[PDB]
Symmetry: C3
Subunit: 88 residues, 3 copies
């Protein structure tokens, strides 16, 4: 789970790109990790609310999962744009 992201970081450290590109490649996947952690925190909050009050939290989990997906899409796009301009 943190392997897949750290693996990308290693690749981004190996690719013959300039410093700016490397930062963008690395930061985009670290953002995915950040949003995944925040989403899992929200999921824990939802579960905590359910445990305490026996109440659902509406679309809280769906909204958090959508945040992760967008972060992932942002990462794919970033990598595509950069690594296609770098060579295509």
């Amino acid at each position: 789970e943190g392997v897949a992201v750290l693996l990308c970081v290693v690749i981004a450290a190996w690719l013959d790109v300039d410093a700016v590109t490397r930062v963008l490649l690395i930061s985009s996947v670290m953002l995915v990790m950040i949003v995944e952690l925040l989403n899992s925190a929200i999921e824990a909050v939802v579960d905590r609310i359910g445990s305490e009050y026996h109440e659902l939290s509406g679309r809280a989990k769906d909204l958090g999962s959508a945040a992760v997906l967008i972060a992932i899409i942002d990462a794919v796009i970033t990598w595509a744009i950069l690594l296609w301009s770098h060579f295509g």
Copy 2:
């Protein structure tokens, strides 16, 4: 909806394009995370318990900083672009 507006009018060099798009997409991400927190706080039945207005303020603040960051990003880049 005005995000996809920003994206298509960003579509300049590749690196700059990534920065313009990403700054706006970060706003989307943060807004979704803020909306998730809101869905918990304002859930059905929340009126019967202790309610964290603080949580919603903090989440809205995160959106504000994301937006401000996006403005600073576009301003610096576009000022570099023209003039």
Copy 3:
């Protein structure tokens, strides 16, 4: 709904960790403005530290929700805070890595 400016001030007043990170952000932004770097590099130096503030605000929002329930420890409450704190940590690590790579490539 939430009040953003009210929220910013509340985070500052109530969270010592937010003030600590906030002053670090201000220092970095001032340095970023002072440094002789191109626009792209400047944007990255600034956005990377600003992300810490964004994530800390979200983390603090998460914390406020579970704390509102009660003071007594619950495993799910601890889990939520740990995950939120890990997110902030990764944002900070990312910021330092960004600064290290960009500054060293430009000036090293």
